[PDB]
Amino acid sequence: MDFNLSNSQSDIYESAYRFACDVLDQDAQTRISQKILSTELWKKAAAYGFAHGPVSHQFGGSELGALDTALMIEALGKGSRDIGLSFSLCAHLCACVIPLYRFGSSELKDKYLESLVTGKLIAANAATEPDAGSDIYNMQATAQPCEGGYILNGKKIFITNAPIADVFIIYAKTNPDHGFLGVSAFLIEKGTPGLNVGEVIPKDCLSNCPWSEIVFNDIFIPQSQRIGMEGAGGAIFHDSMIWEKGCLSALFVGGLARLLETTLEYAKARQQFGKAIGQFQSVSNRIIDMKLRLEQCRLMLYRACWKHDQGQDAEADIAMSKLLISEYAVQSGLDAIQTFGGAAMDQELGLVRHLLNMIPSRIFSGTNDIQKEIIARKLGLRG
Amino acid sequence: MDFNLSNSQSDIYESAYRFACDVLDQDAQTRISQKILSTELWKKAAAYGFAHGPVSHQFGGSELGALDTALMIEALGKGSRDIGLSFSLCAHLCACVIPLYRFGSSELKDKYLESLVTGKLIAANAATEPDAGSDIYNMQATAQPCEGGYILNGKKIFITNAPIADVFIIYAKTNPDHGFLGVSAFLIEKGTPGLNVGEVIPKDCLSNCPWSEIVFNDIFIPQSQRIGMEGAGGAIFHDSMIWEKGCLSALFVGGLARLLETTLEYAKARQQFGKAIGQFQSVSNRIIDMKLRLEQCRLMLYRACWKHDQGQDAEADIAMSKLLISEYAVQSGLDAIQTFGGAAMDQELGLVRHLLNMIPSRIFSGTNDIQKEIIARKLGLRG
Amino acid sequence: MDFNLSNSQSDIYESAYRFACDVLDQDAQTRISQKILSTELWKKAAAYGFAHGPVSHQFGGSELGALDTALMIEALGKGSRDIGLSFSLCAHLCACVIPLYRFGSSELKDKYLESLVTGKLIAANAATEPDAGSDIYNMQATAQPCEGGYILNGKKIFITNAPIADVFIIYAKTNPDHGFLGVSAFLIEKGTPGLNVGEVIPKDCLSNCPWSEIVFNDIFIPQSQRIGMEGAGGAIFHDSMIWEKGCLSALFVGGLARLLETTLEYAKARQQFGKAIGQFQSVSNRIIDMKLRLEQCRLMLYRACWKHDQGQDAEADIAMSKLLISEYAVQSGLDAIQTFGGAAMDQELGLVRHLLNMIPSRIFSGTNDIQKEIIARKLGLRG
Amino acid sequence: MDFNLSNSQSDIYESAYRFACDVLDQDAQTRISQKILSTELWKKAAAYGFAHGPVSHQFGGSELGALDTALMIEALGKGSRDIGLSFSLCAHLCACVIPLYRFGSSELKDKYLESLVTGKLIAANAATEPDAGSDIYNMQATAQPCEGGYILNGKKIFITNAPIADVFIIYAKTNPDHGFLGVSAFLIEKGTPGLNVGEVIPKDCLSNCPWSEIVFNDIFIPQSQRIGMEGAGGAIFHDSMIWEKGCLSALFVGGLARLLETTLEYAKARQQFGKAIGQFQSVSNRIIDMKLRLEQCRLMLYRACWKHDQGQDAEADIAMSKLLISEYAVQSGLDAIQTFGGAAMDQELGLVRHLLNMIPSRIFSGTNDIQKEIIARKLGLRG
Ligand SMILES: Cc1cc2nc3c(=O)[nH]c(=O)nc-3n(C[C@H](O)[C@H](O)[C@H](O)COP(=O)(O)OP(=O)(O)OC[C@H]3O[C@@H](n4cnc5c(N)ncnc54)[C@H](O)[C@@H]3O)c2cc1C
Ligand SMILES: Cc1cc2nc3c(=O)[nH]c(=O)nc-3n(C[C@H](O)[C@H](O)[C@H](O)COP(=O)(O)OP(=O)(O)OC[C@H]3O[C@@H](n4cnc5c(N)ncnc54)[C@H](O)[C@@H]3O)c2cc1C
Ligand SMILES: Cc1cc2nc3c(=O)[nH]c(=O)nc-3n(C[C@H](O)[C@H](O)[C@H](O)COP(=O)(O)OP(=O)(O)OC[C@H]3O[C@@H](n4cnc5c(N)ncnc54)[C@H](O)[C@@H]3O)c2cc1C
Ligand SMILES: Cc1cc2nc3c(=O)[nH]c(=O)nc-3n(C[C@H](O)[C@H](O)[C@H](O)COP(=O)(O)OP(=O)(O)OC[C@H]3O[C@@H](n4cnc5c(N)ncnc54)[C@H](O)[C@@H]3O)c2cc1C
Ligand SMILES: [Cl-]
Ligand SMILES: [Cl-]
């Protein structure tokens, strides 16, 4: 039992924090105001190491564990205001790079993986459908086996990075008899005949992180573009979501550390009735809640990632961390706004934008109600 | 003890609801998207009766009580998506029309009141300052008595309607010896020398409801433009805030009724795992919270306004209603977003915009921490 | 819309309050300490009017509506510390007297009803079973039709008043083919062969309100002791629970009014750090929550009972009031303890005992989770 | 960063757990029912090691750190239902043994310390007064210096173990000019002239853990019985409370682990409506809250104790852990009762007694409002 980072981990965190502050946070306000995802800046971040994670040196990666990867992402969330870009980059890492590395054939990895790890190519993960959100294994897109590969039809929605992606990691049914056991995963390139990528659909939350629908109209998928074995697509999706929930969520821990520092400074400086507003217990009690939340969810995050790195079953731990981080990120965003009062409306300071950016954290990679269902199942309550 | 509306009250509510749906809600999505406050549409709403409240027939008003006025505003909040326009109109009524009617001289009312009641003129209330928010009686703007009236200097911030107002109801110290007893109220016209109205300052919440700063540089206020007696400005401000907290807050009760209907319809229609999502208790428990909140805060609102109409001391009741409505409006906005999941990001449906519009309700007219301080004082805990 | 009591209602409340203070609360501390239910005192309360409710003058009652009955019970909850006795009396009224009056034949009412209304006889309602709590229509006790009546077998648990009852209102299946439509209700006398009333089972909550199990071993029920029609027992039980949830819950509104007055007095009188503890916002914020809860749940209670008296469908309103009153009674008990600190441990003052007495309010007459299921069904979420 | 116990720590926990189950939990139900604190059993627990903590081998101790000591206490809280005895023992360790070891002279330690570490003698800590609870440095008891020592007068209340203690660690003012700097600490023996120990005062929470008032009437304290330096009594008290809040609170973490296991088993076994009640999300969502709380507060506890063992400033960490453990212990007690419904009233199972035992955890060693004030001060909000 030890609660210090190693020297190596401290160096990883500090280097990522410096890059986030000195590279990505530069001119963030202009990109945020204009709703710009700068692909050239995204690629520099990818190549720095944010697209690497556990990938081996063979493919340009850093062989990091889950805890190391989470520390880099926590630093990114604390140091850069451009959380939409950070979310886009981390989705590419956790839901696209990592499954290709963990399950792709040698041929597929040799063709695509280093390009994704360096950001030469941007990827999008396409699983969710109009009638398959939480009930993902109800997906209806079909990859019908045929001579030489598959014929793919269907529609995916809510696809982060789709408007800017060069490749798509898609999940579809190769056996409509089954749910989970009937899904396979495939890599398809932008421009393939029959792949219709929709225009960006605007949103107020994470507003410069592009998403859109994609429609498959009779796409031919060559056999060599299947990721993993036939029917393994549910397991591949599940594994990718463990990585996304475990490490991507660290963004919001770093964002909460930043928010709490801003909120503490204001509560010490702003005076009403002849005293700092932090001296009123209505004000300080909320700030203490923010502090309590930050410390608890950071420890839960670190333990979930450490358990994964030890080879232990961390599924419940990752569901608990994803739930706590996202709940605490939203609640603390509300508490920071309450601390500032009318001053919270300022768009430069961005407290309201911060709350908006935290709202989807309770939805992405499985809603928090679904996290409770996962934990309930691990506790024996779904037998 | 009776919980029905009278026939007259039902007619007032239904007429206001029809106007909100059939006039104001028409083309609201375009104005919301473009961040437009249509002054011509605002004036039609004012003249319909939303700028009338308790004003007598002599000045074009309807002699409504607080409960009647709140019902009209509740209908407005349920029927029109353009809550920024509705907030702007209700601020003009509660913080400008009503104090002028209740405290202005015959001469001032004869010159200005009917124009404000018909919306011929738009008014803004200017009390808050950089160093006087919750601690309003710390305001530093000074109206120094001089031959013929006053010399006014100072700065006001967060002033709803300032960029579009023709007249300003301003509060300033006529005696810097005192706080509350040292404030007077004045009506000043747009264009008076020394009145510098700032450009609109954008915000994400209530985004088409304009606000800005105003600076007074050596303005001469003629004696006849003082509203009420010298030093009564604190009492006038206080009375105006009772009306704003009591009736303007009804907007958010009507908005919660609308939100709950939308949320119920979706939870019945959207299916996952082979059933409507409303069949999962994680989903329905939040919707029941929304229902419980709506019923409780509507009754608290109605009782506060009824008590005022009976001539009873309703200050604690109004503080309790303002606190409950705004807390419940924010919490229910969060719960509706959670019900919809990724579907909540759609900008046309506007669930995220609705949450943004509810966030300032816990701040305007006195924060909810200040409402607790008012209630504490009424309960004898601040002696 | 009116929020005053009538003169008649004010008189009912005040007379009940005086009886609760001047009769029942006398020597309550001794009975509470010794865990005594004084049947002679219970009978005086019954005869005063607490066993009357809506029963007609023909049978000794007062023809009160639900709101009148709730006011009497609210006064009882505020004026008497002996809430175990009050709960016992109100269970007899709402679950035994009222169904016999509403559904019993002329012959059964002529034999028993006036005796129950005067408290000459004490009754217990026996519905719950080991395997039928929330799922009450799963009850397994059987009243098998036979020549002359029925043969009754089964076991009931959690039966308030069973150790002191002279008569039992029992629910059992007359058709094991059905659930709700298969239940009938019967009145059986203490001492009937085969009726085995268990010894009192102690509890820490409502500790002097006796309950026990009852076992039926081949009881013969004569035909004339069926209450209502064959198979109407589910409807009779349901109606009785509407009365119990609607009016019995008023006990806890009166108890919260008493608790809040005690808590306010202490927060003004107790000083630490040179000021009354009510001046610290951590302390006052909880007391304001208690006040907000009291006002909201009293209005919800009154509206539910008024709607019933108007002949409107009040089922959702009664479920909402039962849920809010019991949740707020428990939360406010916790908040009063927090206000007093170590002083809350005093057994004479009884703040901890008060919390214990409120704990079962979230369980009796249907748990609060079941109240949410009822409200969900009324909102169309259980179709 | 590592989240495993060492082999030594696992052995400490497991040995303490076995002793708690196989020695202390034996016949606990009888002692709980009769409100008995068995001093002979208490002494066996003390001698086993529960009175040792950090005390050196010289005095019979085990030289444990704070984390080791907390693990032993967590095991005690999980393994023994007799939490009143466990609280009594841990108060003696943390508030009496530890300050004597850390601050007492060689002469005082040689006379008393090994006897306290073996439980040969029981000690009580007497700091709180009628007018000095949270505001402890307002204590009014006076130890007036005189020839040969001090004359002690005053009154202490809420003193755990006073009715059974052989020695008292008392705090009193040696300089009524100052608060914190004016307090000194002393050891006095039962039977000293002028020491009047009150009779046990009963309570419903921790009901077999005796407490009482003590009155000092002109007690002569010889100079050699002062613990530490003159005026160091505030620092000694503060240090003792760090140990009590840091390690004694582990009792409630172990109790929550036990409660959660009991609650999970019931939610799997109890069926209504044809399924285990754990399958209803209203039920499982609360159990998941219990699980989330247990994991978070155990990690916060372990980190606070580890930081203390590393020589770091752990004051904020200990205040955060004491607050979270006690809040989560109370909330989880409420949630377990809600899970069981009417079955929670059973006195043998003791769910209601468990809630009662957790209620004072939010008060002892400083209320949770005071913990927030400590954290606020550490965050710079009390400057
Ligand atoms: C920012 C963001 C980025 C995203 N990026 C991607 C991406 O790149 N690729 C991709 O494939 N998808 C992506 N998604 C989609 C995401 O996976 C879905 O939003 C998620 O699976 C939830 O599905 P849904 O939104 O359809 O909600 P629904 O499943 O319709 O849920 C609606 C409500 O019902 C509740 N509910 C549903 N089932 C249950 C149940 N069994 N028990 C209890 N409650 C239940 C939910 O918790 C929620 O409250 C993204 C979403 C967001 C918000
Ligand atoms: C939508 C909107 C419209 C507005 N329109 C107008 C307008 O037209 N005219 C106008 O004059 N003003 C207007 N205002 C300003 C409004 O009156 C102020 O925002 C309000 O008075 C709060 O002051 P503040 O924002 O400076 O917050 P502060 O007073 O700085 O409060 C900051 C924090 O400290 C807390 N706090 C302060 N004092 C205490 C205390 N004693 N106890 C406990 N907590 C305390 C607050 O509750 C809050 O959490 C508007 C504001 C909003 C949001
Ligand atoms: C003070 C008191 C007095 C009583 N007096 C009487 C009396 O005089 N006569 C009598 O007949 N009975 C009486 N009862 C019993 C009472 O009716 C039952 O306690 C009640 O019906 C709940 O059943 P249960 O206790 O078996 O809990 P269970 O039904 O076992 O419930 C256990 C848990 O599962 C939850 N749960 C169950 N089903 C669902 C569902 N569908 N959805 C979500 N959650 C669910 C519950 O809410 C609870 O959290 C009394 C109870 C109390 C506490
Ligand atoms: C189980 C138990 C065992 C105990 N054992 C001992 C023992 O052995 N020896 C001993 O000396 N004492 C003991 N105590 C007493 C304990 O130290 C006091 O209860 C504690 O210091 C709180 O003081 P109080 O109870 O007088 O509450 P008060 O100080 O009167 O507090 C009342 C309320 O005011 C609040 N409050 C007070 N000041 C502030 C503030 N500045 N800001 C915000 N809120 C504030 C509190 O949080 C609380 O809500 C024990 C108490 C308990 C419950
Ligand atoms: Cl305060
Ligand atoms: Cl469910």
Side-chain angles (χ1 to χ4, degrees), chain C residues 355-372:
Chain C
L355 171 65
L356 289 170
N357 292 332
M358 299 307 102
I359 286 289
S361 69
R362 298 200 293 188
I363 304 166
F364 96 93
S365 284
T367 71
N368 283 356
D369 303 314
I370 272 47
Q371 304 316 306
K372 289 170 193 198

Side-chain angles (χ1 to χ4, degrees), chain C residues 11-312:
Chain C
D11 286 351
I12 286 165
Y13 177 90
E14 292 306 340
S15 176
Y17 183 71
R18 286 266 54 87
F19 185 90
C21 290
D22 295 343
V23 179
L24 297 178
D25 194 55
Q26 305 298 308
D27 198 40
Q29 304 286 264
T30 297
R31 298 193 308 280
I32 289 166
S33 294
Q34 296 187 15
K35 304 181 179 60
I36 293 171
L37 189 301
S38 171
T39 61
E40 295 180 5
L41 185 62
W42 188 109
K43 291 173 177 265
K44 282 185 180 175
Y48 162 85
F50 291 108
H52 293 190
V55 176
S56 65
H57 293 139
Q58 178 176 0
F59 301 100
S62 302
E63 302 167 5
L64 297 188
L67 179 59
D68 289 338
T69 296
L71 288 167
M72 282 184 79
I73 295 176
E74 183 185 339
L76 175 60
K78 194 181 187 180
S80 175
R81 292 166 293 178
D82 189 357
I83 182 71
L85 184 149
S86 297
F87 184 91
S88 164
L89 283 158
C90 293
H92 162 99
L93 171 62
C94 297
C96 302
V97 167
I98 293 178
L100 176 65
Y101 173 60
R102 289 282 289 176
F103 295 88
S105 65
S106 290
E107 296 86 343
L108 267 183
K109 291 183 294 194
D110 283 353
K111 185 163 181 178
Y112 296 104
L113 182 57
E114 184 178 354
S115 289
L116 295 167
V117 168
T118 60
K120 300 184 254 281
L121 298 173
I122 299 181
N125 163 43
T128 300
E129 303 193 0
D131 296 306
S134 294
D135 184 11
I136 189 54
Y137 305 121
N138 192 45
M139 66 175 68
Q140 296 297 302
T142 53
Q144 174 181 318
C146 62
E147 187 165 9
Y150 307 78
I151 302 299
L152 172 73
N153 281 285
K155 177 171 175 176
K156 300 299 194 181
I157 63 169
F158 303 152
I159 304 310
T160 295
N161 294 325
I164 58 172
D166 300 295
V167 301
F168 297 80
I169 307 301
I170 77 94
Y171 295 88
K173 296 274 176 70
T174 40
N175 187 342
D177 288 335
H178 307 209
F180 175 94
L181 293 174
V183 175
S184 296
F186 305 89
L187 187 156
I188 66 175
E189 298 182 359
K190 177 184 173 180
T192 311
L195 176 62
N196 299 123
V197 176
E199 299 288 87
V200 61
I201 302 178
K203 46 176 177 292
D204 295 327
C205 305
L206 301 167
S207 64
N208 69 330
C209 183
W211 71 358
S212 66
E213 310 175 358
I214 325 160
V215 177
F216 314 135
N217 293 301
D218 283 330
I219 293 176
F220 176 68
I221 309 178
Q223 188 65 48
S224 61
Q225 285 175 223
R226 188 183 73 208
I227 298 164
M229 298 176 35
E230 195 90 339
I236 297 168
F237 181 71
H238 177 84
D239 189 76
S240 85
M241 292 303 100
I242 287 286
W243 281 91
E244 197 178 81
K245 286 189 298 185
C247 298
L248 185 152
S249 295
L251 282 176
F252 311 124
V253 173
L256 176 52
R258 180 190 181 96
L259 182 72
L260 176 58
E261 290 176 13
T262 294
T263 300
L264 280 165
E265 179 185 39
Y266 189 76
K268 290 170 193 178
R270 169 59 172 184
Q271 297 210 18
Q272 288 289 274
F273 306 97
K275 64 187 88 180
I277 58 170
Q279 299 274 2
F280 297 115
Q281 290 167 0
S282 286
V283 172
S284 56
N285 285 343
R286 292 186 293 253
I287 300 176
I288 296 332
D289 288 338
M290 296 168 71
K291 174 66 168 177
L292 290 166
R293 286 171 188 140
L294 174 61
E295 297 307 326
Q296 286 174 104
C297 73
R298 178 183 283 129
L299 285 174
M300 291 289 284
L301 167 68
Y302 291 178
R303 186 170 72 179
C305 289
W306 177 90
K307 282 182 69 162
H308 168 89
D309 288 341
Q310 293 289 124
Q312 298 176 33

Side-chain angles (χ1 to χ4, degrees), chain A residues 142-146 149-153 173 217-221:
Chain A
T142 53
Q144 174 181 318
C146 62
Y150 307 78
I151 302 299
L152 172 73
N153 281 285
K173 296 274 176 70
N217 293 301
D218 283 330
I219 293 176
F220 176 68
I221 309 178

Side-chain angles (χ1 to χ4, degrees), chain A residues 79-96:
Chain A
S80 175
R81 292 166 293 178
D82 189 357
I83 182 71
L85 184 149
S86 297
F87 184 91
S88 164
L89 283 158
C90 293
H92 162 99
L93 171 62
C94 297
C96 302

Side-chain angles (χ1 to χ4, degrees), chain D residues 253-271:
Chain D
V253 173
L256 176 52
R258 180 190 181 96
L259 182 72
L260 176 58
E261 290 176 13
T262 294
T263 300
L264 280 165
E265 179 185 39
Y266 189 76
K268 290 170 193 178
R270 169 59 172 184
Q271 297 210 18

Side-chain angles (χ1 to χ4, degrees), chain A residues 1-4 268 278-279 281 284-285 288 295-296 303 306 324 328 372-373 379-383, chain D residues 1-4 268 278-279 281 284-285 288 295-296 303 306 324 328 372-373 379-383:
Chain A
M1 199 72 56
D2 179 280
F3 295 95
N4 282 330
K268 290 170 193 178
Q279 299 274 2
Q281 290 167 0
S284 56
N285 285 343
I288 296 332
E295 297 307 326
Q296 286 174 104
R303 186 170 72 179
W306 177 90
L324 289 170
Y328 290 172
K372 289 170 193 198
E373 297 303 286
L379 290 175
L381 298 173
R382 297 286 178 268
Chain D
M1 199 72 56
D2 179 280
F3 295 95
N4 282 330
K268 290 170 193 178
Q279 299 274 2
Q281 290 167 0
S284 56
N285 285 343
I288 296 332
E295 297 307 326
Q296 286 174 104
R303 186 170 72 179
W306 177 90
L324 289 170
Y328 290 172
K372 289 170 193 198
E373 297 303 286
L379 290 175
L381 298 173
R382 297 286 178 268

Side-chain angles (χ1 to χ4, degrees), chain B residues 278-282 284-285 288, chain C residues 319 323 367-382, chain D residues 273 280-282:
Chain B
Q279 299 274 2
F280 297 115
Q281 290 167 0
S282 286
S284 56
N285 285 343
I288 296 332
Chain C
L323 177 153
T367 71
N368 283 356
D369 303 314
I370 272 47
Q371 304 316 306
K372 289 170 193 198
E373 297 303 286
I374 291 168
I375 299 156
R377 177 171 48 75
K378 295 304 297 192
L379 290 175
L381 298 173
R382 297 286 178 268
Chain D
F273 306 97
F280 297 115
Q281 290 167 0
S282 286

